[PDB]
Write a protein that binds this ligand. Structure first.
Ligand SMILES: Nc1ncnc2c1ncn2[C@@H]1O[C@H](COP(=O)(O)OP(=O)(O)OP(=O)(O)O)[C@@H](O)[C@H]1O
Ligand SMILES: Nc1ncnc2c1ncn2[C@@H]1O[C@H](COP(=O)(O)OP(=O)(O)OP(=O)(O)O)[C@@H](O)[C@H]1O
Ligand SMILES: Nc1ncnc2c1ncn2[C@@H]1O[C@H](COP(=O)(O)OP(=O)(O)OP(=O)(O)O)[C@@H](O)[C@H]1O
Ligand SMILES: [Mg+2]
Ligand SMILES: [Mg+2]
Ligand SMILES: [Mg+2]
Lengths: 434, 117, 212, 485, 134
């Protein structure tokens, strides 16, 4: 069935958004923001007016998608009118962004028709000579994660960028993107004064009909590139119009928990791709049993699923450690006290099962630390940045120089949570109460 | 830490191999691409001095890091542990998986100054 | 147009790998995460999947052997252009030094310079960069994975070579740090005792055959 | 040889290391530097960014208004007179001096200093004063703070030296060179707080050269703050800067009106040929259209800006935003594209002023999912229960579990409990965290609503509200379900 | 000499005008709107209990004072910040940014106030509706 292959491929690239530009899908709740971004970028590229605007919205809220759609829209009709410089706040640092701007400037100006050669002082003053200072070429700056350059110490790059926006003869468009709602408070006073205070907040999903209409936009094939298109559109419209269908129930569950269309797309894609024929795809979209299987797999390495993989000695040691941590006031325990509780519990069970020695319980203890059931007391864990991690790697911690049986640990799961989802018919269930 | 241990080991390996026979990165891919540069296989003998004074977490992580080099056909690794007190004091300080790793091919040798007079 | 292998207790994971990994760059995600603890068959299933599909171009890296972020960047820049040399031997290239990469933006620049000389190819292709054990870097912080998430956005959009990242992770908490990025993730849960016994028989019986 | 590490990206400028004190055999051997070809200054990239239009673009009636309101002096006359008199007396007496100027952003410091030195250059062009060299050093436009040493010496001699050699050369030039072989130099130090390092050697050197008898140097230091030397500088530098300091106050609303109507002299209350086929307007099928901005609209913009900051940039941007809003409304009703009387009245200015003042925060938490709002509600309940402004995450988990299991008679809770703890499956086991627990936690962390502490124990890790509690409760009261229980 | 030249022997009056030009919280309060005056009263009251408080902690205290008094309409946080920014440019409220002291260490904006407290109580006790807010 090559027609099913064509329909499956079309549905898959609609779900990945990799359509041609004229066929790109804009959701109805995203349309006002898309028009506002289109007006700003058209006033920059067509009409040579300088602009400064920060896009504020959560992750996966189509900030990059709308900007890329607008730039590819103006790419096909005004190609020689503008160049694009892309900076990302994670990849680029305050010194490295100068070199990135210079290298993108030379490779973008060689694409239409050196600036990037020398030390950092020379490169920066050459960029300033080009920008600080027929039609003029617009320079569009796309600044992702712009909050990292609005720091508390100094904001040199944002100062010079907004100075180029407000006081230069080359027209420049600067788009910032961030997740921080209070991005204007991050800005220094002179940087905020040079900024235009134009902040666009990305639209959120307000009602369930927005999610259903977006799913309808994603899964309806609007071109007749397969013979199965009409039946697929009919069955999809039948499932979406029915309020009691399984797909509507999954959309409602997403609206109540995640409220994220990329989250739903990540489940819809293997439902579409794992089907082998047209009727199998129709049964899959009518039942959505694969969505249940996917949801079960997404939770299988959580705290609930990791406990169900434990052995009887592992579960007994974990219960004993949770008992010792509950009785403690700092919630702290070690291997010796947990082994004392374990041997007490085994004696009171066999008085009313093999007792293992401390040498063999050492391995189960190490596995429980490895599976993130226990953690070291007041441990910071993974550091935020490379500098603090580098500082931590050059320090010898006091919990790594004492013997293992005296190291203080704290529970990632408490005894009440242990009682909740260990089954009532289990052997050690009675000792989850204290 | 483990990073400095590996970096000193790979600098020593590269320096000694070029002394006996272009810059590389001092990590375990130099062990991976050893026969592609030098044309012959490799035998590494690690001599850990003053283990009783070493951080056993760092030593354990370095041993587990060296374990990844067993997937290369041209690599042979020997470890020498200079121990001042006894074996049980260091087997209580390593992981049980590390003890199971070291037990596969190991030899104890009691050589002190005051041995048998 | 991909072959699904048969892995004994990883059938869902193998169907997920078939659903996410294809030669077409349009219907392949930029990032893919395989998450599971030790001995859950992540490497085994990924190797079986790439052995069942020889047309897929994969580059394998062990982030544990590289320890730090700078050797990881240099390893990526070395192995990508070595694979591209051995894949299209008639394409004339320039051998950039991987030790020139000292910063992430230098990796972006070097990958751009490598990828602009394979522009005579016919079809868009996928290069799969497999980081087997990303959170096993001794020197790891919370900001390193964000760079690899957003790396594809700095590379050219209409290139013939489109790099795809497959990450392998151990810790659930490390993965849950990045949940708002909505990366497709396949979970490999810990095996049953029955499955452990079956795997042990089917992988160790023939080794117990020819023991002397 | 085998290297321990490599530096393969070193880019080193071609700057010599020998200072000016060794350039000649003696002090008496130094010639007249004014009669030297490379001294005192005696744009290669501007053709790079040009291309052919291949289009005639549409300039509507509001476009000329928006170009006239860009940042690119009716109210600064006393400050101009003071700065001009001090610099004029220092130039024509061969004196060295420091003029300190401070102010809040956008009050016209840089513009007044540049107009002062423009009028001074006009005075020296007609031989009223000796000729001088003008140098601008902006501290925020330097890669390194020592690069100012490299810049000024390159502006004085034409040499390219390294920074310590440059500062030795400047020290020798200001101190030892006689006045009859020299020229006056006026240096504008803009963004002076950026030139402050740990050891204040740059500030000491720049203000100590002005205390040299032979220097013929005038430093105009422009700063954010009146008491920046008293806050961040040593007592020697504060003594050298001086007691006489010039304050640039924020503008009153009459002066902001004067600035805006000076920008709108040639198009406000004027006629245009509009060409309603396309909307492209030409200043004197085609209609004669009067354009006006309301004087009361400028009044309310100037009054709001003058009360808040006095920033001229803010007032010009407010009026430009109002013109943009009016232009968007105008092009909506005709479909003019880009390729009677139209007025920028009060309501456009009010919509421009309020769009910077309305908060999206309460609107943001209004449109969150049920689980994120349940997180916020449980955090507020814990904050009012134990009185702490910092709550453990395990306490929030137990509070969410308690609120679900206590309000088990609510119909919404009945409908949503299976979703929240099983994802509606009856094949997923009951979970210890709710569905999308880590998702909504990370979402509130990216938004900046929450702060979290760096601990790897999830239960004893603490969480704080970064936003106001009153905003959080006002968001939580808008929901129909959470305002009931 | 410069003031003599601009305004035109020297004398004592020009020396005194130098010291008058190149060198006060009663006049700053007297120029404020009763809405602005309430904000300054709440801010100094906010730094009594916490004594290292943010904008959003000062604004939380301000919304508490209103509901027990019902004097003037309660306003929003952003409006609170611009009146606090109005008190920047007349010289009463000062705003900085530093890492907060606590279990979480990230950067917050704070209010500090140094206005003479002797002249603050004199100006506010004349107005009857503001006396609950001291
Ligand atoms: N150029 C693109 N083409 C197609 N789909 C895209 C493109 N860019 C992003 N997407 C898709 O858009 C969805 C999320 O939007 P997007 O990536 O723009 O988020 P964002 O709000 O910019 O994120 P962040 O704050 O993390 O940078 C995802 O499904 C992603 O795959
Ligand atoms: N499903 C399976 N069928 C057969 N053999 C298996 C299976 N899963 C694992 N094995 C065997 O067990 C070994 C361990 O699995 P594998 O190396 O894939 O684990 P992993 O999850 O990648 O571990 P780690 O995180 O330690 O790298 C495999 O090399 C293989 O020999
Ligand atoms: N008196 C004025 N008359 C006309 N326009 C003015 C006046 N003052 C300021 N402006 C406008 O405001 C802009 C900002 O002024 P300027 O660059 O001098 O500010 P500044 O005081 O140096 O501020 P910052 O501390 O932010 O650098 C000027 O470029 C000009 O467009
Ligand atoms: Mg983005
Ligand atoms: Mg593996
Ligand atoms: Mg200025």
């Amino acid at each position: 069935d090559p027609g099913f292959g064509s329909l499956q491929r079309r549905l898959l690239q609609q779900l990945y958004g990799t359509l041609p530009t004229d066929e790109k899908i804009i959701f109805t709740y995203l349309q006002d923001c898309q028009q506002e971004i289109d007006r700003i970028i058209k006033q920059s590229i067509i009409q040579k007016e300088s602009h400064s605007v920060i896009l504020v919205g959560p992750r996966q809220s189509y900030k990059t998608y709308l900007l890329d759609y607008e730039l590819s829209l103006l790419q096909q009709s005004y190609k020689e009118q503008f160049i694009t410089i892309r900076l990302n706040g994670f990849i680029h640092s305050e010194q490295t962004a100068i070199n990135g701007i210079a290298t993108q400037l030379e490779q973008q100006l060689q694409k239409i028709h050196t600036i990037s050669s020398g030390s950092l002082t020379e490169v920066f003053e050459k960029i300033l000579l080009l920008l600080d200072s027929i039609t003029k070429i617009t320079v569009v700056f796309i600044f992702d994660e712009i909050d990292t350059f609005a720091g508390p110490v100094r904001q040199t790059l944002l100062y010079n960028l907004f100075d180029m926006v407000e006081h230069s003869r080359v027209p420049v468009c600067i788009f910032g993107c961030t997740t921080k709602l209070n991005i204007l408070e991050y800005l220094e006073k002179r940087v905020k004064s040079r900024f235009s205070q134009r902040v666009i907040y990305m639209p959120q999903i307000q009602n369930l009909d927005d999610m259903v209409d977006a799913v309808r936009n994603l899964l309806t094939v609007r071109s007749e590139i397969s013979p199965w298109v009409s039946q697929w559109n009919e069955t999809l419209e039948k499932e979406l119009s029915d309020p009691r269908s399984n797909l509507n129930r999954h959309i409602r569950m997403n609206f109540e928990t995640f409220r994220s269309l990329p989250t739903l797309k990540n489940s819809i894609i293997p439902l579409v791709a794992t089907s082998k024929n047209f009727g199998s795809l129709c049964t899959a979209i009518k039942s959505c049993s694969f969505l249940d299987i996917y949801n079960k797999n997404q939770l299988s390495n959580n705290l609930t699923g990791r406990l169900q993989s434990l052995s009887d000695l592992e579960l007994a040691i974990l219960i004993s450690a949770a008992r010792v941590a509950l009785r403690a006031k700092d919630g702290s325990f070690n291997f010796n006290l947990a082994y004392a509780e374990y041997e007490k519990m085994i004696k009171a069970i066999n008085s009313r099962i093999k007792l293992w020695l401390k040498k063999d319980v050492k391995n189960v203890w190490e596995n429980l630390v490895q599976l993130d059931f226990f953690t070291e007391k007041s441990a910071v864990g993974l550091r935020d940045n490379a500098t603090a991690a580098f500082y931590a790697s050059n320090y010898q911690f006091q919990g790594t120089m004492i013997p293992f049986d005296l190291r203080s640990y704290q529970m990632q799961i408490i005894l009440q949570e242990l009682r909740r989802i260990i089954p009532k018919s289990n052997m050690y269930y009675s000792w989850t109460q204290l | 830490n483990v990073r400095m241990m590996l970096r000193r080991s790979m600098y020593k390996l590269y320096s000694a191999a070029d002394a006996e026979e272009n810059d590389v990165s001092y990590d375990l891919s130099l062990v991976e691409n050893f026969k592609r540069l030098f044309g012959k296989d490799l035998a590494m003998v690690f001599n850990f001095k003053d283990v009783d004074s070493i951080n056993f977490n760092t030593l354990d992580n370095f041993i587990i890091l060296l374990k990844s080099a067993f997937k290369y056909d041209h690599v042979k690794i020997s470890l020498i542990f200079n121990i001042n007190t006894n074996l049980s004091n260091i087997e209580k300080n390593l992981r049980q998986s590390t003890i199971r790793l070291l037990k596969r091919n190991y030899h104890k040798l009691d050589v002190s100054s005051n041995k048998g007079f | 147009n991909v072959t699904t292998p048969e892995v004994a207790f990883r059938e869902y994971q193998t169907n997920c790998l078939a659903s996410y990994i294809s030669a077409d760059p349009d219907i392949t995600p930029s990032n893919l995460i395989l998450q599971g603890y030790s001995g859950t068959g992540k490497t085994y299933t990924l190797k079986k999947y790439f052995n069942a599909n020889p047309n897929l171009h994969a580059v394998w890296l062990e982030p544990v052997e590289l320890v730090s972020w700078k050797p990881l960047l240099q390893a990526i820049a070395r192995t990508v252009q070595y694979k591209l040399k051995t894949l299209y031997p008639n394409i004339p290239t320039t051998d950039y030094d991987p030790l020139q990469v000292e910063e992430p933006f230098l990796l972006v620049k070097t990958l751009h310079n490598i990828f602009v000389q394979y522009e005579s190819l016919q079809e868009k292709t996928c290069l799969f960069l497999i980081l087997d054990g990303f959170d096993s870097l001794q020197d790891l912080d919370a900001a390193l994975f964000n760079k690899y998430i957003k790396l594809n956005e700095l590379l050219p959009k209409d290139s013939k070579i489109n790099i795809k990242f497959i990450y392998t992770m151990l810790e659930t908490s490390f993965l849950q740090r990045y949940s708002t990025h909505c990366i497709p993730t396949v979970m490999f849960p810990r095996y049953n005792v029955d499955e452990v016994s079956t795997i042990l028989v089917m992988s160790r019986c023939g080794e117990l055959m020819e023991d002397s | 040889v085998i290297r321990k590490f490599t530096k393969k990206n070193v880019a080193r400028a071609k700057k010599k290391y020998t200072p000016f004190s060794k350039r000649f055999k003696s002090i008496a051997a130094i010639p007249d530097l004014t009669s030297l070809p490379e001294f005192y200054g005696n744009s290669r990239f501007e053709n790079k960014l040009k291309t052919t239009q291949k289009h005639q673009i549409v300039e509507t009636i509001f476009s000329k208004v928006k170009k006239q309101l860009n940042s690119s002096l009716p109210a600064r006359e006393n400050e101009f007179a003071s700065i001009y008199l001090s610099a004029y007396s220092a130039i024509e007496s061969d004196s060295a001096t420091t003029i300190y100027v401070a102010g809040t952003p956008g009050v016209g410091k840089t513009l007044t200093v540049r107009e002062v030195v423009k009028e001074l250059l006009s005075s020296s062009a007609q031989r009223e004063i000796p000729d001088f060299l003008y140098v601008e050093i902006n501290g925020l436009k330097m890669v390194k703070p020592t690069d100012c040493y490299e810049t000024l010496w390159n502006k004085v001699s034409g040499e390219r030296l390294t920074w310590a050699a440059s500062m030795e050369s400047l020290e020798f030039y200001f101190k030892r060179v006689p006045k009859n072989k020299k020229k006056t130099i006026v240096v504008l130090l803009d963004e002076l707080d950026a030139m402050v390092t740990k050891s204040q050697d740059i500030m000491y050197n720049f203000f100590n050269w002005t205390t040299y008898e032979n220097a013929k140097l005038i430093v105009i230091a422009v700063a954010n703050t009146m008491d920046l030397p008293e806050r961040q500088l040593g007592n020697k530098i504060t003594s050298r800067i001086g007691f006489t300091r010039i304050m640039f106050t924020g503008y009153t609303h009459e002066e902001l009106k004067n600035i805006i109507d000076l920008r709108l002299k040639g198009l406000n209350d004027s006629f245009f040929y509009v060409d309603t086929k396309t909307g492209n307007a030409i200043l004197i099928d085609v209609r004669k259209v009067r354009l006006r901005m309301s004087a009361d609209a400028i009044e309310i913009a100037s009054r709001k800006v003058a009360s808040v900051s006095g920033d001229a940039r803010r007032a010009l941007k407010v009026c430009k935003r109002a013109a943009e809003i009016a232009e968007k409304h105008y092009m909506a009703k005709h479909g003019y594209g880009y390729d009677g009387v139209q007025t920028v009245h009060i309501t456009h200015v009010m919509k421009a002023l309020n769009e910077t003042l309305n908060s999206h925060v309460i609107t943001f938490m209004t449109r969150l999912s049920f689980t994120a709002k349940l997180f916020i509600y449980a955090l507020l309940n814990l904050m009012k229960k134990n009185g702490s402004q910092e709550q453990e995450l395990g306490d929030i988990v137990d509070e969410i579990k308690l609120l679900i299991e206590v309000n088990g008679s609510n119909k919404f809770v009945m409908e949503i409990a299976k979703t929240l703890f099983q994802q509606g499956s009856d094949n997923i086991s009951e979970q210890l965290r709710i569905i999308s627990w880590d998702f909504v936690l990370n979402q509130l962390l990216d938004a900046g609503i929450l702060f979290k502490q760096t601990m790897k124990n999830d239960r004893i890790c603490c969480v704080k509200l970064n936003i106001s509690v009153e905003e959080a409760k006002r968001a939580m009261n808008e929901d129909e379900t959470l305002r009931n229980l | 000499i410069e003031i003599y030249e601009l305004e035109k022997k020297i004398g004592l009056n020009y020396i005194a005008k130098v010291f008058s030009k190149f060198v006060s919280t009663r006049t700053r309060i007297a120029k404020l709107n009763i809405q602005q005056k309430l904000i300054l009263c709440t801010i100094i009251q906010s730094l009594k209990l916490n004594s290292d408080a943010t904008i959003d902690e000062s604004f939380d205290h301000y919304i508490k004072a209103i509901t027990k008094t019902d004097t003037l309409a309660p306003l929003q946080r952003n409006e609170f910040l611009e009146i606090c920014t109005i008190l920047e440019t007349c010289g009463l409220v000062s705003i900085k940014k530093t890492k907060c002291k606590g279990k979480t260490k990230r950067f917050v904006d704070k209010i500090d106030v140094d206005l003479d407290m002797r002249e603050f109580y004199d100006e506010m006790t004349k107005i009857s509706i503001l006396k609950p807010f001291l």
